[PDB]
Amino acid sequence: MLTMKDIIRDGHPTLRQKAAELELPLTKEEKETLIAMREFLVNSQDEEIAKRYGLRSGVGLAAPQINISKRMIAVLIPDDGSGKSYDYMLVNPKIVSHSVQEAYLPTGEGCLSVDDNVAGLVHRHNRITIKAKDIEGNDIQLRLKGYPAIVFQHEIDHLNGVMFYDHIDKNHPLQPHTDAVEV
Numbered sequence: 001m002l003t004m005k006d007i008i009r010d011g012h013p014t015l016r017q018k019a020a021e022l023e024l025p026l027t028k029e030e031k032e033t034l035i036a037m038r039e040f041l042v043n044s045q046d047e048e049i050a051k052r053y054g055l056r057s058g059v060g061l062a063a064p065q066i067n068i069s070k071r072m073i074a075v076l077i078p079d080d081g082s083g084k085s086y087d088y089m090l091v092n093p094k095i096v097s098h099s100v101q102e103a104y105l106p107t108g109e110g111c112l113s114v115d116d117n118v119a120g121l122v123h124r125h126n127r128i129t130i131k132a133k134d135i136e137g138n139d140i141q142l143r144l145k146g147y148p149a150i151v152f153q154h155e156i157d158h159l160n161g162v163m164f165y166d167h168i169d170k171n172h173p174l175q176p177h178t179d180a181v182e183v
């Protein structure tokens with residue numbers, strides 16, 4: 001299983017690279033790592049297993065974060081009230097369209113790869129459409145709003161060498177953009 005030992009940390013060069021598109025089908029090895037990434041999320045969200053193996057809690061992970069510079073991500077966002085949950089392993093995900101309307105988490109964002117907490121609002125598109133491939137090379141189109149959309153954008157940024165804190169206003173970190181919605 002993956003652990004925090006596997007997660008590379010801010011300053012590591014792989015995080016600042018652009019990750020390579022995968023050829024399809026995936027190798028037995030690539031499928032294995034994408035399942036393991038999902039398994040990390042699951043494990044990190046279990047109280048017991050996370051205490052035991054020293055796991056930070058996560059809802060998303062991009063392959064660059066385990067030092068594999070390939071365009072695959074995993075997102076595990078549990079039910080949390082509404083009956084909606086997000087359990088997705090995506091290959092070559094792409095944002096094909098979005099809202100003009102920005103949104104933001106009012107406490108900022110975190111990142112498994114960033115050891116410190118950073119304060120600052122990270123403005124993002126409130127709605128997105130994503131086209132990607134699943135683990136078996138079938139076609140996936142996702143329409144996301146709000147928290148799920150922020151999460152996927154965060155992980156997609158990882159595939160382009162962008163970190164959440166790059167989007168934070170150095171002067172006015174906690175100033176929302178006008179008409180940006182709080183999530």
Ligand SMILES: O=C(CSC(=O)[C@H](Cc1ccccc1)CC(F)(F)F)c1ccccc1
Pocket residue numbers: 045057058059060061062065105108109110111112113150151154155
């Ligand atoms: O905040 C988190 C997890 S933090 C997280 O998923 C990171 C990214 C993140 C995205 C959007 C908002 C905050 C953090 C993942 C990373 F580091 F792997 F990319 C949480 C976990 C379980 C229950 C409730 C909340």
Ligand code: NI
Pocket residue numbers: 110111112113154158
């Ligand atoms: Ni992150």
Ligand code: NI
Pocket residue numbers: 169
């Ligand atoms: Ni700004």
